[PDB]
Every structure is written in structure tokens, then in C-alpha cells.
Swiss-Prot record, chain A:
GO terms for molecular function: asparaginase activity. GO terms for biological process: amino acid metabolic process. The active site is at Y75. The chain holds residues 202 to 326 of 326 of the full protein. Belongs to the asparaginase 1 family. Homodimer. Heating induces higher order association. Forms homotetramers at 80 degrees Celsius. Catalyzes the hydrolysis of L-asparagine into L-aspartate and ammonia. Displays no glutaminase activity, a highly desirable therapeutic property. Consists of distinct N- and C-terminal domains (NPfA and CPfA, respectively), connected by a linker. NPfA acts as a specific internal chaperone by mediating folding of its own C-domain (CPfA), but also functions as a non-specific molecular chaperone by preventing aggregation of unrelated proteins. The linker is dispensable since domains of this enzyme can assemble without the linker into a conjoined tetrameric form that exhibits higher activity than the parent enzyme, while each domain is inactive independently. Keywords: Hydrolase. Microbial L-asparaginase is considered as an important biopharmaceutical drug enzyme in the treatment of childhood acute lymphoblastic leukemia (ALL). It functions by reducing the availability of circulatory L-asparagine to tumor cells. The principle behind the cytotoxic effect of L-asparaginase stems from the fact that the leukemic lymphoblastic tumor cells and other blood tumor cells are auxotrophs towards the L-asparagine and exhibit low L-asparagine synthetase (ASNS) activity for de novo synthesis of L-asparagine. The keyword Hydrolase applies. It comes from the Archaea. Coiled coil: none annotated. This is L-asparaginase.
Length: 128, 182
């Protein structure tokens, strides 16, 4: 099974650890964002780091909240994260998000392909 | 009629000794000690006997293979598992066993089946009732509720109501001897 990393978004978080993850051979990253999801567009280098890395590995966005999903069309921070290549996790649980990404990576490494699959309701995990 | 129970270990099967050792019951011994005496035509298979915190992705490959080689032979399968990673396993198995021919029900308990106030008997009986329902798929049974396995999360760490269906309706809920689906 492919190695995935799950990092909680917190105020001031840098893109540092994400480069390190890619450099370490991690094949996917899940970020638990705030609320409906997104990435700060100022105050850190996180968004710029993600614009780069989202091309090399799937970077998936779920929420730190327990209920309701993410919807990255809802807020500017979400829409900018989408523009940066972030893959939304919709209303999936965190366990489904992580395991789904791991399962997909067993079959492919094409990030745009991974993105279609993450967004497709494979077995009832997601409302697509 | 025909049910397979697969053991993975977990608190449900835990047995600790005053001299400090930690042992584990096979899945047949779990059912017996839980007082389930009406599970006739049930086979038992012990796949693991581990604290579920030890679970790694290799274990999901082994479990899925084992599930694949049994889904045609049984009408339902129940997997007993530690609660800490129960929802990761139920989620991964859902992706690995895409639309199985039978109900596959993951369960466990917050209190070892050896204790007199255990939730094991309730969870096992719920799992057994649903494994006979003819409703195919991967599910979690817990605290009298049946939940889609790929929509389940552990929400509490020290309560019998440890698991919830997140953003999705509960599949069935126990009322007496009856699982109610609405």
C-alpha cells in the first residue's frame, strides 16, 4: 500500500513539511482544513507551495470538523485552493478519504486521474 | 443460515492477567463467553489476535483476500475487530471488496466480552441479525445500530456509543428483537 500523509491545517502552517513529505517519497497528502475547506491566500507560503506540489502528488482537502463535508466552491480560500490543484474530499469521512486515496494510488500515479477517482462515488462513500 | 465469523482481536477479545500478561480469545471463545448460544451453522476463522492500533495496510490485503475466498460460501460474514482502527478497516475493505454478494459486518466492543456489563453481546447479536438480512455490502454494527462501513467513524473514546454514520443515514437500528430500517 502507498504511503499517505495526513496533516491538520493550523494558523501559520508553512509549506515546509509538505515539500519534505514529497522529498521523502510520500505519494499523497491529505490536509484537514477549517470548515468547508480552503487554503490561506496570505500569511504563509502554504498556497504557493501547494500550487507547485499538487502537480507531482495528489493533495486532498477534507475538514477538521466532524459533520457536513467540504465544499471548496463556497469560499475564496476554497476556490483558490481548487485553482492551486487541491482535490476536495466532499462529504467523505476522514477514514474513507485516507483509505480511498491509498487504494487509488495502488492503481495509478497520474494526479489528474487520481482527481477524477477521488471525486467519483466508488462504493457509497461520497455524494458526487 | 450460514455465517462465518472472522476474528481480528481487539478489546472484545481481550483478557488481562494480574501478573501483567495480556491474552486474547479466539473468535469462537468470544461468542461463547458473550452468551450467544443461538448462532447455529456458524463457522469461525481466526485471522489475527491484535490490538487494532497495530493494524497496517498489509493486514487489509490479507483480510480482503480471506473475505474474497469466503463470500460465495456463506450468506453473511462478521468480522470482530478492535475499535481503534475498526473504521479504517471497514472503509478500506469497502473499496477492496467492491459490491460483495453478501452482508459483511464489522463489529467489536468497548468492554471485553469477559466482563458482565459488556457491550459485546449487544454488538454481536446486532451483527448476527444483520448478517442474515440479505442486504449486501460492508457495514459496521455498534451500540444497536448498523452503519454503512465506508461512512463510519469513531466519534467517542470512552463511551458505548463509540461510532456514528457521518453525513449518511443509519442503515438499521435495534428495537427489541427487530432491526428497523427507517
Amino acid at each position: 500500500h502507498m504511503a499517505v500523509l495526513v496533516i491538520k491545517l493550523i494558523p501559520g502552517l508553512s509549506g515546509d513539511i509538505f515539500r519534505a513529505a514529497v522529498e521523502l517519497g510520500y505519494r499523497g497528502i491529505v490536509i484537514e482544513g477549517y470548515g468547508a475547506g480552503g487554503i490561506p491566500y496570505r500569511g504563509s507560503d502554504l498556497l504557493q507551495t501547494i500550487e507547485e506540489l499538487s502537480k507531482e502528488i495528489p493533495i486532498v482537502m477534507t475538514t477538521q470538523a466532524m459533520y457536513d463535508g467540504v465544499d471548496l466552491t463556497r469560499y475564496k480560500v476554497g476556490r483558490l485552493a481548487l485553482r492551486a490543484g487541491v482535490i476536495p474530499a466532499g462529504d467523505m469521512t476522514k477514514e474513507a478519504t485516507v483509505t480511498k486515496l491509498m487504494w487509488i494510488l495502488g492503481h495509478t500515479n497520474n494526479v489528474e486521474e487520481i482527481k477524477v477517482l477521488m471525486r467519483k462515488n466508488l462504493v457509497g462513500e461520497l455524494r458526487d | 443460515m450460514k455465517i462465518l465469523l472472522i476474528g481480528m482481536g481487539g478489546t472484545i477479545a481481550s483478557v488481562k492477567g494480574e501478573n501483567g500478561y495480556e491474552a486474547s480469545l479466539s473468535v469462537k471463545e468470544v461468542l461463547d463467553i458473550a452468551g450467544i448460544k443461538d448462532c447455529e451453522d456458524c463457522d469461525f476463522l481466526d485471522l489475527k489476535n491484535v490490538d487494532s492500533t497495530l493494524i497496517q495496510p498489509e493486514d487489509w490485503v490479507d483480510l480482503a483476500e480471506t473475505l474474497y475466498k469466503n463470500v460465495k460460501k456463506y450468506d453473511g460474514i462478521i468480522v470482530t475487530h478492535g475499535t481503534d482502527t475498526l473504521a479504517y478497516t471497514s472503509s478500506m475493505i469497502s473499496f477492496m471488496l467492491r459490491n460483495p454478494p453478501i452482508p459483511i459486518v464489522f463489529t467489536g466492543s468497548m468492554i471485553p466480552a469477559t466482563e458482565e456489563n459488556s457491550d459485546a453481546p449487544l454488538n454481536l447479536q446486532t451483527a448476527i441479525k444483520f448478517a442474515t438480512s440479505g442486504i449486501r455490502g460492508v457495514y459496521v454494527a455498534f451500540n444497536g445500530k448498523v452503519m454503512l462501513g465506508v461512512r463510519t467513524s469513531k466519534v467517542r473514546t470512552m463511551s458505548r456509543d463509540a461510532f456514528e454514520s457521518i453525513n449518511y443515514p443509519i442503515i438499521a437500528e435495534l428495537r427489541g428483537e427487530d432491526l428497523v430500517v427507517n
